[PDB]
């Protein structure tokens, strides 16, 4: 049902940036996984 939404991607990215504490919903696409991983790397570098 709830595959993905524009409003949920923002929440997931915001949670990832701030140490990835708040619960989020993962995407259902292989292509989006690479973008999520790159964003996570950027977030970890930024936090450090």
């Amino acid at each position: 049902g709830p595959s993905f939404t524009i409003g949920k991607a923002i929440w997931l990215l915001w949670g990832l940036v701030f140490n990835n504490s708040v619960p989020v919903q993962n995407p259902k696409g292989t292509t989006s996984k690479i973008m999520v991983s790159v964003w996570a790397f950027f977030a970890v570098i930024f936090l450090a």
């Binding site: 990832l16 990835n20 989020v24 993962n26 996984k33 999520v36 991983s37 996570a40 790397f41 970890v44 450090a48």
Partner: protein, 46 residues
């Protein structure tokens, strides 16, 4: 399999992508060691 690669990448980058479950008893120790190594690397970089 892709599940192991996804789990390793998520552990290293702390992204939560994927739900890899290493039910193998031997693989559990390797997973814990990999998580510790990733934590040590991040702490050293910081």
């Amino acid at each position: 399999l892709s599940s192991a690669m996804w789990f390793s990448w998520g552990v290293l980058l702390n992204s939560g992508i994927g739900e890899g479950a290493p039910r193998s008893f031997s693989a559990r120790i390797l997973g814990m060691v990999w998580a510790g190594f990733a934590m040590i690397i991040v702490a050293s970089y910081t």
